[PDB]
Amino acid sequence: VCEADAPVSRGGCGNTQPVVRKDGMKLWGTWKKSR
Amino acid sequence: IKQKLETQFTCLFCNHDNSVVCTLDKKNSIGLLECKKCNLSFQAPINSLSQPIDIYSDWIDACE
Amino acid sequence: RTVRAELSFSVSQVERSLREGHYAQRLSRTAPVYLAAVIEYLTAKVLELAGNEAQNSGERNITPLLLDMVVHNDRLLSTLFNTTTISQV
Amino acid sequence: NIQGITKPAIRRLARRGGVKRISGLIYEETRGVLKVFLENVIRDAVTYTEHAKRKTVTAMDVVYALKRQGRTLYGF
Amino acid sequence: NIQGITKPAIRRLARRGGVKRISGLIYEETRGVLKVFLENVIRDAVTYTEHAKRKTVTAMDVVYALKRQGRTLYGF
Amino acid sequence: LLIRKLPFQRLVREIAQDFKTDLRFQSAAIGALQEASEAYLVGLFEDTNLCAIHAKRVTIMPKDIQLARRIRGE
Amino acid sequence: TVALREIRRYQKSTELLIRKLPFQRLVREIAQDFKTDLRFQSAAIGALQEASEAYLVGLFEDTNLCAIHAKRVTIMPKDIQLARRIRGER
Amino acid sequence: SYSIYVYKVLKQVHPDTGISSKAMGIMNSFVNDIFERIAGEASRLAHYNKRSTITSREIQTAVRLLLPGELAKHAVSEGTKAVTKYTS
DNA sequence: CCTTGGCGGTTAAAACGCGGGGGACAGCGCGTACGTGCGTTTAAGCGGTGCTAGAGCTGTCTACGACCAATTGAGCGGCCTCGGCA
DNA sequence: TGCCGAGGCCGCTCAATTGGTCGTAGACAGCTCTAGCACCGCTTAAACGCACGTACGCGCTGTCCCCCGCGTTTTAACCGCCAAGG
Ligand SMILES: [Zn+2]
């Protein structure tokens, strides 16, 4: 997850990050929406 | 360990394709189909050799 | 009208909420001034005690622990919060 | 299961409440009181979610379900 | 006065409540509970009458005052 | 009704005088107040009874009433 | 004594007393029994836990009063069976 | 919504004491609750008398009904001495 | 040479048996103040006309504030200038 | 000695002001309802004393189930290893 706060703000936006996968010439990202 | 697999099968009710998820519990021989859309659930027995196409086949016969 | 009435809440935004809440078909001329005055009194009575308790305890800011300790103490307004629960999370 | 509400968590809660010594037949009762409280609040939270055509029970559905019991919750 | 709430009328209420035996100090404690209940309901009934620009407390002002305590009253 | 209705009316008018003056009452208003008051007292006595029985006390005492009222949030 | 100590401590603090994970599992289980795979905002579960713990704590206050009323220092089933009855929960 | 005015009243009542970010959401849910309770009650009042306009008199009665005792007294004195200062 | 299928290794704490030692539950004794059914006498309670009018019920009349439609002014965010602490 | 922090200027979006309908809200009249407040006759309901009884409470006992501490140990939940494939 990209932290909005230091582990104090680090400039983060708080969003969780996706697991990006390659499928030929296309890239797919799977985000885990907030078990 | 359970297997959570996405499939490219069409739900027999809501007709959304690529939205059926198959959960195969081999420790208890219980397979579970789930939609991701309308989320209808269907349970059926599985062996050790079964695959998402085996329970999805049993779901087609359970309707007809 | 807020400075003219020498108040701190906007009679306007609250009036807009009343229009959006559709609590009636038509408001009065001085009904939102009374409601903002009354609301303003309740906020300046709760935060007056939170600011009295932050300096009585010695705290600098106002935490939700200060709100939970005040509103369930202070029998003046503890009756308003008989059935409330500040989450503290 | 309801067994996740353990013995020392009910004991801790009792300590917060002001209980000194606690008899054994109180955890099950609490487990049975807590389950009734959740079955009364989650029913209304699921009713607000099904009314809002959602699938995710937000925290405002829980605040509305607690508001329908005279248990207003501030901070959400 | 509150003394019109006689000893045997509280005794009758207690009997209607299922009480077998009554101590000699319930009588002044029940009048102090009844006076608080009337001071809480009549305040709201007088508020509805002063809001309705009347001088006669009708029975619907009493029904509204009991409705504001979770004591809905049918038949008026 | 278990209370002399008239006494409930007197007491009522007295208490009411302390909130707003020169008030008048419909007879049905007083009757409503009496039904409500008596229902309330009866229920309270049920709960009090339960408290007394809880404390090897089936016979209500002021202590029992106070417990009942505290748990009711009164 | 240690009991008293804990009461002085817990009453001083406001952190949640039930373990998060376990509570999340209980809520999702119960909810699963009404509607299958219901997704939850984290704040929804947090709301449920705050509400549940406040409820249980208050219940334990009343229960304590019921035990003390019966000249006891230990809370039992007859206490809750009384507190909840007078509350109009049962 | 109402969070910008809670800090503005706090600057008057305690210009030295600050407030947190969760306590601002608590005071903002408190204000939106006592607003949607007073307006709701007032709406009930305007229906019981078959009126159509919520005046300041239905707000004064909903304050007398909702707030218990001295908070209602003080609540009705501040609204009256704000409407009179408004009309002048 | 690299990344998943199931599997040890990775913690805060409780799954607490169970060794120790005591607060306190429920039955049992005694033991005293209070306590209601029955008794008296009463002062208010239930049901009837007689009288007198306040304001609700229902009717049509006259009426002033909101709806949605074109103007247009102030608060706020993105450029852009000014200025003393490091 | 000089650039990023703060206030000012130029755009954005929503709030404030004005003019025409418009049915619903406020006035007002005719008129019957049940609440108005005053007196009878009778009666169900209420004020005050009794007394031996059942309930309410204090004190001592049994044994007994929660009280406090320790140790790994296990689910649940975070971090690294077996040896098959493509
Ligand atoms: Zn489907």
Author numbering:
A (entry chain A): 147 to 153, 163 to 189, 194
B (entry chain M): 15 to 78
C (entry chain c): 21 to 109
D (entry chain f), E (entry chain b): 25 to 100
F (entry chain a): 60 to 133
G (entry chain e): 45 to 134
H (entry chain d): 36 to 123
From the article:
H2A.B is a distant histone H2A variant associated with actively transcribed regions of the genome, suggesting its positive role in promoting transcription. Among the H2A variants, H2A.B is the most distant, with about 50% amino acid identity and a shorter C-terminal tail compared to canonical H2A (Chadwick and Willard, 2001). In vitro, H2A.B forms a nucleosome with flexible DNA ends, and efficiently exchanges the H2A.B-H2B dimer with the canonical H2A-H2B dimer through an intermediate “open conformation”. In the present study, we found that the H2A.B nucleosome is transcribed by the RNA polymerase II (RNAPII) elongation complex more efficiently than the canonical H2A nucleosome.
To reveal the mechanism by which EC traverses the H2A.B nucleosome, we determined the structure of the EC-H2A.B nucleosome complex paused at the SHL(−1) position by cryo-EM single particle analysis. We conducted the transcription reaction by the EC with the H2A.B nucleosome, and the EC was intentionally paused at the SHL(−1) position by performing the transcription reaction in the absence of ATP. Under these conditions, the EC was paused at the position 42 base pairs from the nucleosome entry site. Surprisingly, in the EC-H2A.B nucleosome structure paused at the SHL(−1) position at 4.8 Å resolution, the cryo-EM map corresponding to the proximal H2A.B-H2B dimer was not visualized, suggesting that the H2A.B-H2B dimer proximal to RNAPII is dissociated from the nucleosome (EV3, EV4, and EV5). In the SHL(−1) complex, the RNA nucleotides within the RNAPII catalytic center were visualized, identifying the RNAPII pausing position, where the leading edge of RNAPII was located at the SHL(−1) position. Therefore, the proximal H2A.B-H2B dimer dissociates after RNAPII passes through the SHL(−5) position. In contrast, in the previous cryo-EM structure of the EC-canonical H2A nucleosome complex paused at the SHL(−1) position, two H2A-H2B dimers are maintained together with the H3-H4 tetramer. The proximal H2A.B-H2B dissociation may occur because of the weak association of the H2A.B-H2B dimer with the H3-H4 tetramer in the nucleosome. The reduced SHL(−5) pausing and enhanced run-off transcription ratios in the H2A.B nucleosome may be consequences of the proximal H2A.B-H2B dissociation during the RNAPII passage. During transcription on the H2A.B nucleosome, the RNAPII efficiently passes through the SHL(−5) position, concomitant with the dissociation of the proximal H2A.B-H2B dimer (right model).
